[PDB]
From Swiss-Prot:
The keyword Hydrolase does not apply. It comes from the Eukaryota. Disulfide bonds join 2-122, 41-171. Salivary gland (at protein level). This is Nitrophorin-4. It comes from Rhodnius prolixus (Triatomid bug). Gene3D superfamilies: 2.40.128.20. The lineage of its organism: Eukaryota, Metazoa, Ecdysozoa, Arthropoda, Hexapoda.
Amino acid sequence: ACTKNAIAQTGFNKDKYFNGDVWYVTDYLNLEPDDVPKRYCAALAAGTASGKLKEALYHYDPKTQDTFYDVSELQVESLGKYTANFKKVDKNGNVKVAVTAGNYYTFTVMYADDSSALIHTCLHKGNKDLGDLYAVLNRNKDAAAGDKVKSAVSAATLEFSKFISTKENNCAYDNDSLKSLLTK
Ligand code: HEM
Ligand SMILES: [N+]
């Protein structure tokens, strides 16, 4: 179960965050033990497509090779806080699992600048018991977390030392698919 009401960044700049470009997860913190593997790869694109606020996701388990993409229209709860009903798609946007009630994630941007961000997400998917997940993002897939975002982790009363890095997993991403999925 999720337990955190994450606070969105004061003065969050939505148009800059949702500019159509890609964000890579560089580090993550799952609050519930064993909710996720200790080696993982994830990235997203975020943008407005034909007037609609969208995110495209990519997940890859570098050990098992499990791979999946998603696309969602985000609904607004407040500035920087969204609810996203997701559909599983192949890389070309063909639907594998349709949107359905009870399949949604929340998404809160706690900190962002042009190059880095800190987000919280809570996944709801059928009768799974999933918990809070924080992620440090960067525009550059190889970037070590800088002082702005690490200070934001501290300001959220979290310990960056607990976050797990994705950088040692040989992660390679299809940025073209993520961008094009925004339209799907
Ligand atoms: C931007 C950050 C993230 C968002 C918005 C997000 C969202 C989601 C969504 C929507 C699903 C379900 C997809 C589907 O069934 O179609 C999912 C599944 C999953 N995510 Fe993430 N995720 C993010 C990052 C991560 C990270 C960093 C990990 C670390 C391992 C992770 C681990 C998983 C796992 C293991 C599943 C499979 C759950 C299951 O069905 O048992 N995610 N995520
Ligand atoms: N997740």
